[PDB]
Design a protein around this ligand. Structure first.
Ligand code: FMN
Ligand code: FMN
Ligand code: FMN
Ligand code: FMN
Ligand code: RMN
Ligand code: RMN
Ligand code: RMN
Ligand code: RMN
Lengths: 333, 333, 333, 333
């Protein structure tokens, strides 16, 4: 019986080999951006409203044309067989059963078509390939398999310097492969190529500058994820949570604005919402639950987050996620 | 001989069973709001005035039609027999003898009429019942018994997630019951129902948004308590002390504005006053004193707070609480 | 060989009885204001100037009609025989030989006339007596003995709550007495009585509010000391260093503006100067040096501070204290 | 295999005698400015840009008429034979081979002409001599030997109070001497004397006030180094990184603006650039690498910094250093 997301991190550290726990936990460089994601959420306080009608509190949203049960999706995390033998299929099944979107990775350890067959209306995360037309082929595979959005990762012209991985000499076990199969830096040209090749909404993940948010709308994106890649890319990149309010104001409803990095409770989901997010992504905690207890672990985590989101919303006087977006906040110490 | 309120916490931790100390000490979630209540007071500094007439320093106030000896009341705390066998009666007697108002709880472990019979002009705290007309019956019982104000708790549509209690598996001992006897969320409609059913002042406890303070005045409240429920309700709710000055300015004398959360000395009372509070509530420390030494413990705590309030006021150049409200403050680190 | 003021605190803690070290070190209440005095100085950074003429760097000032060797005086500290058998006479002799003013206390453990006979042009600190005309008699004694200024302490309507002293049960040894011999709160009337009874400059020690600084000038004060009494009076009083710049601007040269609280190096003297102080007082460190090594200890401390002040000034491009007052500062973390 | 600059500090502490490690690591006074250099960088976050062309990322700059491989030079550090027997020659050879400028010190432990003979287009750091025409003789020696800029240190009218050195009784071993051979404070007159005696660019190192930056341009400087001398001069001097943006704006392209103090990664170089620096100096880390492994150690450090700078730039969307200067930043906690 886990009563917070931190109970699951403790359980995952017990089970996983050290080097795999480090691949999961780590960030780039000195891990300043990884720590700052948590700092930034901890400094945000909500100003709750009282005495509102809570007869029919709902945590549901509509996004990219589908109803979701919570304002949350599972973030793209590569190589989930590292954490549990059922890898992506375990997490995808749990997500489906919880009504939350699951992002299938370009570097998934089970093929995208197998994970899409689980059901649950899935999203697909794209890394740009050096071999471009292979890029558009992954996108078409994803669309043919029933994925509902293309989450184009735009913060990885190459992978950051993960010092834990270097120190550990980490490499994929022989038994974990990139099951969908040397990548190139993406540009605004790449975005347009993808937009022209699909009818699915294109979501740019890894935007932090206001002007890049605005350009994303101008480029025809359906959404952005305001994100420093969990502190795994530029060490010293600002947390997404610190940019979110400014970005929300700048796009002024022109696309969905998601945030990630450090979300560890339903109260953090409420903070993100109050700052203007349409939804959040959650990465590491979903992998902790997978490592600890497989599919059932992920189910328990999603049930716990659902309960915490509903609790937080109602304590704050919000019968709907839209009401939560109208909450005010105060930055503390 | 206790020389600070912290001496009493040490004494209560020694005597109480762990799970009961945790019920008392704990907050919701990660306990961020519980910690922030203390942080927020610690960052406030007073700018004292010198060379004023202190011939007749008085700590008295008039509130809800009665003189009180200090700008303080005992906060509503449920189930006080958990802490000492004499429970509410011990605290109520001490409060009476100190000249400070005592708030009788809807979840008192001794009936409201027994505690009111102690004397001391008492207040009554209301939780809204799912069974509404039972709500108005508790209010009428309280008024018939001589309570002087109705403290309507508006921040508990349901109880928060108290992880210490969950982890401990805490439940009331068989020997502690809700002696006044399934509740429902309160709304502004509920407030009006209460206001129409009583001539007593209605005080809304748990207001943090400025606009809710203003609506409270418009709704005919006689007072509000600016409060995050001691960090026991929404985890991430702003401390009341951080909202107080803004709220005081917004109501511009339309009702009494009390604050609670983390008050642990007469100097903290002075801070609250300087920020504009009419009075404060004190919760946990009163229970520490009750656990440590029963009625006499609570008497000692009230005498110590009285001394500290008078000391602080005079060192700050204030012959009256109104003068203290005109002090300026500076936020530090 | 002491190379910083902190070397002397270590030496004094070794020698003094615990309860006497606590009388010296302690503050009121939770000691928040005592800690904040240090915090506040630590957050101030100087913006030094380069490439100025330093041929004739001088640390001298003119104050209350006399040249002083440094922009520093020894603060009033009661009962110096607590620290060393030669008490006040040891400190006064050292101060004389260093060219810095020494403040003789109303609660000195050697009579004011004996300490004045040491020489060095001394100041006299006044506590207002309940018996008023005795007040004016102490002032006249001081003036007859050759004191050069009356430092009227205005922040002690009564003594603060020193919890270390309470816990230790501290009291003066039989062998330490108030050698100049039930006091009353001072008012603006008291200030005028003193001003009318002496031709010496009257300096009000313990001013923190801007308006009290202004009133001090209007009342004919020759100086003020911006001070929270070393955190020994109101617990939660703002540090003087945090008020200084505002106060300096408000009096706009109408009286000398001194500061105290936490000065522990020549660099801290430079900070105080840059914020606009005419001079600083130093309390605890002078007593550490007295406890450690008597007169010679105090001499060593004054020589070390002189060296640090001259070093700091010159590294900052300041050939005179007036130049140091024109330095700019930046508040950091 | 070192994967961060901190790996080299650990290696140098193992090898060097304590008193020599302290000479290198220490600062003046309480070491507040030394610590603040790190604090200040840690509070700066970069707002990276995405989706830019990174086909030809280059870390090169043009400065003082020469191409440099990175926006970095080796800071002047006296007496490098303290750290390794090959001293300056080892560091100069490494710097040459990495394409980065090396600053030859007036207090070098190998003569300036020997170090210049290594090649690599070197700079020369000047301390003003009490014997002035000797000053201009060092400058002419440097120019005759092929140095490309005169880095005039303007923050050392005399050496600061290094308490570690005092406590250790540190002095140069007999086997380390000032191989180029009682100095005097420099003034603006001295700057002009140097400017009139050389055609090389004159760079003033140790400027922190905005007005001194402006005067430097007016005086004909080719550059300034915004610097508190690694916290070794005035204890309480503001970090250069906290002044940099203001200074850059004030000179508005009138000279090159370099910064130093606490640069410990390529990400810190990116921060400095984003705040407007033309280039940085790096001191202590270069000496750590020299102590640990001599010339090859310094080569490894420069290769690691090159990799980190290129990584940071590209993750931030910058194909050139000029693009990096146009990045925005956000100050965090
Ligand atoms: C082990 C690991 C692998 C990841 N792999 C990818 C990836 O393949 N694609 C991607 O866009 N983001 C990837 N991310 C980043 C996440 O999508 C997400 O931005 C980050 O984990 C969110 O922060 P959180 O983990 O603090 O919730 C990865 C994160 C982790 C921890
Ligand atoms: C054990 C406990 C029980 C409480 N029960 C109630 C309650 O029944 N009604 C209510 O309005 N507040 C209740 N509160 C909140 C207090 O009235 C008050 O808002 C909070 O304790 C104030 O903070 P302090 O304890 O830091 O002084 C309770 C608090 C505690 C600690
Ligand atoms: C042991 C002790 C006794 C003091 N006695 C007096 C006093 O008799 N009169 C007075 O005006 N201030 C008194 N003070 C306050 C000092 O004058 C001064 O304001 C404070 O010590 C300055 O701070 P510092 O000790 O941090 O330098 C006393 C301080 C100490 C520590
Ligand atoms: C051991 C040591 C010796 C130094 N000697 C000189 C010097 O002779 N001339 C000079 O201008 N700066 C000198 N400096 C200061 C550096 O040039 C530089 O400003 C400072 O080291 C930069 O900070 P960093 O060490 O944090 O990178 C010295 C620094 C150290 C640590
Ligand atoms: O952090 C991630 O996205 C994941 O570890 C990853 C995989 C491949 C390239 C860069 C990064
Ligand atoms: O915190 C309190 O008010 C107290 O523990 C309580 C009792 C009943 C419901 C919610 C909360
Ligand atoms: O702090 C001081 O001034 C000193 O301890 C003191 C002495 C007498 C009354 C109040 C205070
Ligand atoms: O810090 C330095 O510049 C170096 O230690 C130094 C050498 C000579 C005088 C002052 C300072």
């Amino acid at each position: 019986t886990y009563v917070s997301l931190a109970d699951l991190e403790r359980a995952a550290r017990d089970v996983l080999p050290g080097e795999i726990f480090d691949f999961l936990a780590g960030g780039s460089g000195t891990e300043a951006s990884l720590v700052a994601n948590r700092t930034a959420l901890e400094r945000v306080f909500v100003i709750p409203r009282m005495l509102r009608d809570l007869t029919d509190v709902t945590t549901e949203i509509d996004i990219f044309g589908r109803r979701a049960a919570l304002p949350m999706a599972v973030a793209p995390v590569a190589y989930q067989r590292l954490f549990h033998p059922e890898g992506e299929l375990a997490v995808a099944r749990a997500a489906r059963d919880a009504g939350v979107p699951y992002t299938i990775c370009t570097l998934s350890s089970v093929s995208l078509e197998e994970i899409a067959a689980v059901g649950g209306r899935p999203w697909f995360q794209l890394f740009w390939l050096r071999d471009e037309k292979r890029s558009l082929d992954l996108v078409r595979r994803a669309e043919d398999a029933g994925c509902e959005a293309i989450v184009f990762t735009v913060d990885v012209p190459w992978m950051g310097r993960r010092l834990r991985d270097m120190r550990n000499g980490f490499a994929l076990p022989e038994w974990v492969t990139a099951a969908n199969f040397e990548f190139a830096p993406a540009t605004w040209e790449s975005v347009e190529a993808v937009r022209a090749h699909t009818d699915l909404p294109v979501v740019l993940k890894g935007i932090l500058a206001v002007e890049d948010a605005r350009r994303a709308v101008d480029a025809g994106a359906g959404g952005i994820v305001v994100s420093n890649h969990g502190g795994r890319q530029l060490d010293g990149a600002v947390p997404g949570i610190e940019m979110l309010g400014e970005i929300v104001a700048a796009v002024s409803g022109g696309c969905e604005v998601l945030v990630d990095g450090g979300i560890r409770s339903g109260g953090d989901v409420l903070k993100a919402t109050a700052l203007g997010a349409s939804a959040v992504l959650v990465g590491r905690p979903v992998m902790w639950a997978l490592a600890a207890a497989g599919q059932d672990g992920v189910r328990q985590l999603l049930e716990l987050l659902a309960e915490e989101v509903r609790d937080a919303m109602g304590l704050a006087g919000c019968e709907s996620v839209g009401a939560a977006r109208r909450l005010n906040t105060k930055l503390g110490v």
